[PDB]
Amino acid sequence: MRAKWRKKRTRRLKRKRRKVRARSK
Amino acid sequence: SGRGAPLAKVVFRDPYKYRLREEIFIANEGVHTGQFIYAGKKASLNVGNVLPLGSVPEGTIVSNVEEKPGDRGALARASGNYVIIIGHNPDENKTRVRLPSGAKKVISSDARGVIGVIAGGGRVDKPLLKAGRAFHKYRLKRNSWPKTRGVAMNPVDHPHGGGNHQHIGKASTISRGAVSGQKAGLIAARRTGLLRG
Amino acid sequence: VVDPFTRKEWFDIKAPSTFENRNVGKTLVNKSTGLKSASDALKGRVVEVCLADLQGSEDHSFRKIKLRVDEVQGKNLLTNFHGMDFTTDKLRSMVRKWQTLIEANVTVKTSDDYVLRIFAIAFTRKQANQVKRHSYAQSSHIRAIRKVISEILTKEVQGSTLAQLTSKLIPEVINKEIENATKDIFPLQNIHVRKVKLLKQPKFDVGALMALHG
Amino acid sequence: SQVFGVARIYASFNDTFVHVTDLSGKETIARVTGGMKVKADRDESSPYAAMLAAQDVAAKCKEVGITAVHVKIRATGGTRTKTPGPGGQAALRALARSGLRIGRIEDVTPVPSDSTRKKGGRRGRRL
Amino acid sequence: AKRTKKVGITGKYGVRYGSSLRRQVKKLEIQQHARYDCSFCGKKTVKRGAAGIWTCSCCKKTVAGGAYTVSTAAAATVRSTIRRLREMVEA
Amino acid sequence: SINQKLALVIKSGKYTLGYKSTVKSLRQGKSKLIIIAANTPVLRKSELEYYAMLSKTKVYYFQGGNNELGTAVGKLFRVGVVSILEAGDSDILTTLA
Amino acid sequence: PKKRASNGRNKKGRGHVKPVRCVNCSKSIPKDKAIKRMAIRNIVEAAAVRDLSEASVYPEYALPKTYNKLHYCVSCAIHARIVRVRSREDRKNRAPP
RNA sequence: GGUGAAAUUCUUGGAUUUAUUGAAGACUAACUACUGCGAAAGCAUUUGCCAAGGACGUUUUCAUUAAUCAAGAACGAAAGUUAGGGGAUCGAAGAUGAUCAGAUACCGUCGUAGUCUUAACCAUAAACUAUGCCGACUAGGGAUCGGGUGGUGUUUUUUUAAUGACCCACUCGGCACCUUACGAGAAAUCAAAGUCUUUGGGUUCUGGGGGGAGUAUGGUCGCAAGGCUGAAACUUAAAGGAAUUG
């Protein structure tokens, strides 16, 4: 994959994690 | 009160009887105390001067415009609001304006309006921000606040009212040819939903 | 079912007398029916013509002229000068790389209430014994040239009416008056007014119209 | 001695228009396209249907009083390709040999002094 | 001392009303109470009397200006464009 | 190109500054140049035109308000009018400007 | 690797020039990176001028010749024969012919 | 109308096409360059104003005032976000008609945010000439831009007169360019990537096999989007560079 969509997919994962992490916090 | 637009105690000498005639104008952006206002056909073009729309050239900014010659002002009286003259029709003694609503209107040349946007502009750009300001805004206008939603009302009290759930039930859009009592909700809605999409 | 070509009278065209042969061309509109007279229908139309046709010389192959009908004398229609534009071939022809062109524009009325926009074209010239590959301008002579050209153009339409303008423009004296006032700054290759657009027309004044047709 | 009209050819892709008008250009005479000549939806831009469409005008361009014509070639223009299609060179040739005195032939392709955003996108069409 | 970081004038509104509503009112309430130079006496003494009324404290003048500024941008362009129309008609 | 020579007046020549001092300095007739701001009230400048006409002395209209004039005269306060009692190596008096 | 001395563009010392669309696929490319062709052809065919002269009331005709600048992306240019992939040592040959 | 082909779409109420205007918004094509400016990002209509500049010239003037630069700071394409205006084109999303086996992709039509502006944010790009900045030196050339110097050179109403453009010999500065490699480099290639094992002009930042990973955490900035700082466990013997042959 390009450097772009590897980064984009981790960015989407980071977005998901922060909501879940804060959801308990 | 009940009007953001400030008034101007403009004073004219009555040419027929010795007495000054104190007359209420809506102040424009740039008029101050002691300023001379020149009203009439042979007036100059400065902010505050009242001129017939025929003399003033195209592409200017005119507020407090008369719909017909002699109505003593009808259009663009709200704060910060103005009418752009977009063209003239000197053959038919009728000018062409762009109204604040975006509508294009035809006005008699003999009609007139002050020059310059109405003062008090930007009033809506700050939220009332609390119920107290909203109450004190409409206290000086009329009893039209608070405005209870028809849905919360009982069926007897509003067409939308009633039901075990707070819902309108019928389409909120109401025909124009409806009758008093029908016209609750969206009256004669050409197209509902969000503008710009 | 109803053939359209069988309901016209084939009206003609007149050119202003400050031109070559007055007659230009014959156009079809309709019969002069009782409800709508053919005169009103004919009015307000514009016809594109070639200055080579309206002067008889190939010198004027470009700069096609635009005419507008004014009064319908029977089948023969007199016209006022409405504008002129270069043919798209000629504009593309004179423009070539490695030579800067000058775009000049003035918005000035005639002597009467008959306002038009005068353009002007100018092209930097390959000088004699000159060996630079391009010979561009210095973008300050361009400011200087556009001022002096605009001075020439503004002092021209303001000085004479449209009829006097066209009568003196057909020998192409104006584009020479630009050069001789710019020979002191920079040499130019293609110099032409290149465009006019007519905006406002005053009281028609059939006295003025019949002067140029009669 | 002779009458001038205007041929006013719209020479684009996917269709071609041969549409002779009076010298003023407002009155339309025999506006015929390729779609009326060919029902195969392919010759409509091919020079064949251009030649068949353009020969149909002269079949009726006469006997009305159109002796000569000022041909005015125009491509699509605007933001689009701006070049004339295959019919522009051939539908011209149906006029020439059909018995119409052609004069003052010229292009009137609308050149944008500056256009809007071109249709297709930044990366453009991909096939 | 430095009492607030970013609420500024709007800290009187407490924690209520949200942060965005406080931000819109913040950037206008500053313009509302800011003192402005008078175009007539030259002293930075113009205060807002009412909605759209700007009384210069000295020289007892008052100018009909915007509701939250002595002169709105949408009206400064009015003054500028009125000039050209007056300029072109006369000269 | 006026502001450069006011420092010449402020250092070499003798001035008086403000309205009351100017009209006194016009009444005495010593003043020859008065520079009136544009922000000054038009009535006050109107009768200074009159006093200047009475004294047959040059009146110059500054291209700005009293804030520009106050900076131009070199003083961080504001000045409505400034009068030039005598000008030294400054040439503002002898020049038409 | 580094295929060209000037990367693909006649751009040295700017940082940005302009986007230009292509006359075939409409792809936004720098104007200097484009393949510029001054297509200078007549409205009519080469063999076509004979009938025009025969079928014109103008015995001495002008033979008009239209101008149009086809700005081409290299993706379209190579496919459209406009340019050809050249030898590595012959890549430096910048001469138009 | 559209296509490679079609279909969706609009059309005997007239689409498309022709002409005339009128408005709306966007942009400044051709000219337009191995050309200019800007610190960079960027800047291509005219005209006016405001102020800023670099180069040139200077027998003017201050006379060590300098270079680089942690901390810190302003600007910073596009996208994005907030509020307002604007809202023509194109166009994420979305909807559709084709293609294939599937096509929620490429193609076509419509179309929202967006594209434009006012005021703020973010502070990122293959933000690249992938070549930090300053200094000197080393080879030749040619053009080009801007400035300057000289010619009884050409050229401008007057035919060495009331004087710009040009050509010549130059020079300063710049964007670069062509050959050559003396020299360097792994080579591609480089006149600077040269003056580095004959190793040292000054100075800042960054890298230590590839993944994990620019991830987790923690802090800070941000309306958010996210930016900056930034590992480890674990895992592999290789990824990678430049050229040769097939």
From Swiss-Prot, chain A:
Natural source organism: Saccharomyces cerevisiae (strain ATCC 204508 / S288c) (Baker's yeast)
Lineage: Eukaryota, Fungi, Dikarya, Ascomycota, Saccharomycotina
Secretion signal span: none
Keyword Ribonucleoprotein annotated: yes
Annotated region described as Disordered, given as residue ranges: 1-25
Biological process terms in GO annotation: cytoplasmic translation
Entry's Gene Ontology cellular component terms: cytosol; cytosolic large ribosomal subunit
Function, as annotated: Component of the ribosome, a large ribonucleoprotein complex responsible for the synthesis of proteins in the cell. The small ribosomal subunit (SSU) binds messenger RNAs (mRNAs) and translates the encoded message by selecting cognate aminoacyl-transfer RNA (tRNA) molecules. The large subunit (LSU) contains the ribosomal catalytic site termed the peptidyl transferase center (PTC), which catalyzes the formation of peptide bonds, thereby polymerizing the amino acids delivered by tRNAs into a polypeptide chain.
Homology family: Belongs to the eukaryotic ribosomal protein eS32 family.
Subunit structure: Component of the small ribosomal subunit (SSU). Mature yeast ribosomes consist of a small (40S) and a large (60S) subunit. The 40S small subunit contains 1 molecule of ribosomal RNA (18S rRNA) and 33 different proteins (encoded by 57 genes). The large 60S subunit contains 3 rRNA molecules (25S, 5.8S and 5S rRNA) and 46 different proteins (encoded by 81 genes).
InterPro entries: Ribosomal_eS32
Keyword Cytoplasm: yes
Keywords recorded for this protein, A-Z: Cytoplasm, Ribonucleoprotein, Ribosomal protein
Alphabetized GO MF terms: structural constituent of ribosome
Superkingdom per UniProt: Eukaryota
Gene behind this protein: RPL41A
From Swiss-Prot, chain B:
Modified residues (Phosphoserine): S1, S44, S108, S109
Gene Ontology biological process terms, A to Z: cytoplasmic translation; maintenance of translational fidelity; ribosomal large subunit biogenesis
Presence of keyword rRNA-binding: yes
Subcellular location: Cytoplasm
Keyword Transmembrane helix: no
GO MF terms held by the record: RNA binding; rRNA binding; structural constituent of ribosome
Signal peptide residues on this chain, from the entry's feature table: none
Superkingdom in the source lineage: Eukaryota
GO cellular component, one term: cytosol
Location in chain, cross-link Glycyl lysine isopeptide (Lys-Gly) (interchain with G-Cter in ubiquitin): K42, K68, K94
Keywords: Cytoplasm, Isopeptide bond, Phosphoprotein, Ribonucleoprotein, Ribosomal protein, RNA-binding, rRNA-binding, Ubl conjugation
Family indicated by similarity: Belongs to the universal ribosomal protein uL2 family.
Protein task: Component of the ribosome, a large ribonucleoprotein complex responsible for the synthesis of proteins in the cell. The small ribosomal subunit (SSU) binds messenger RNAs (mRNAs) and translates the encoded message by selecting cognate aminoacyl-transfer RNA (tRNA) molecules. The large subunit (LSU) contains the ribosomal catalytic site termed the peptidyl transferase center (PTC), which catalyzes the formation of peptide bonds, thereby polymerizing the amino acids delivered by tRNAs into a polypeptide chain.
Comment field (misc): There are 2 genes for uL2 in yeast.
Protein name: Large ribosomal subunit protein uL2A
Protein source organism: Saccharomyces cerevisiae (strain ATCC 204508 / S288c)
Gene of this entry: RPL2A
Full protein segment contained here: 52 to 248 of 254
Curated annotation (Swiss-Prot), chain D:
One GO term of the biological process aspect: cytoplasmic translation
GO MF terms held by the record: mRNA binding; structural constituent of ribosome
Localization (cell): Cytoplasm; Nucleus, Nucleolus
Region (Disordered): 107-127
InterPro entries: Ribosomal_uS11, Ribosomal_uS11_CS, Ribosomal_uS11_sf
One cellular component term from this protein's GO annotations in UniProt: nucleoplasm
Top-level taxon of the source organism: Eukaryota
Pfam family, one: Ribosomal_S11
Keyword Zinc: no
UniProt keyword list: Acetylation, Cytoplasm, Nucleus, Ribonucleoprotein, Ribosomal protein, Ribosome biogenesis, rRNA processing
Entries under NCBIfam families matching the protein: PRK09607.1
Record function comment: Component of the ribosome, a large ribonucleoprotein complex responsible for the synthesis of proteins in the cell. The small ribosomal subunit (SSU) binds messenger RNAs (mRNAs) and translates the encoded message by selecting cognate aminoacyl-transfer RNA (tRNA) molecules. The large subunit (LSU) contains the ribosomal catalytic site termed the peptidyl transferase center (PTC), which catalyzes the formation of peptide bonds, thereby polymerizing the amino acids delivered by tRNAs into a polypeptide chain.
Family of this protein: Belongs to the universal ribosomal protein uS11 family.
Name recorded for this polypeptide: Small ribosomal subunit protein uS11A
UniProtKB/Swiss-Prot annotation, chain F:
Domain of life: Eukaryota
Pfam families in the cross-refs: Ribosomal_L7Ae
Entry keyword Ubl conjugation: yes
GO MF terms, alphabetically ordered: pre-mRNA 5'-splice site binding; RNA binding; structural constituent of ribosome
Main location: cytoplasm
Gene Ontology process terms (BP): cytoplasmic translation; negative regulation of mRNA splicing, via spliceosome; rRNA processing
Subcellular location, record wording: Cytoplasm
GO CC, alphabetical: cytoplasm; cytosol; cytosolic large ribosomal subunit
Record's keyword terms, sorted: Cytoplasm, Isopeptide bond, Ribonucleoprotein, Ribosomal protein, Ubl conjugation
Position(s), cross-link Glycyl lysine isopeptide (Lys-Gly) (interchain with G-Cter in ubiquitin): K14, K45, K75
Signal sequence extent: none
Subunit structure, interactors included: Component of the large ribosomal subunit (LSU). Mature yeast ribosomes consist of a small (40S) and a large (60S) subunit. The 40S small subunit contains 1 molecule of ribosomal RNA (18S rRNA) and 33 different proteins (encoded by 57 genes). The large 60S subunit contains 3 rRNA molecules (25S, 5.8S and 5S rRNA) and 46 different proteins (encoded by 81 genes).
Other notes: Present with 59300 molecules/cell in log phase SD medium.
Family: Belongs to the eukaryotic ribosomal protein eL30 family.
Record NCBIfam families: PRK01018.1 (NF002172)
Protein name in UniProt: Large ribosomal subunit protein eL30
Organism: Saccharomyces cerevisiae (strain ATCC 204508 / S288c)
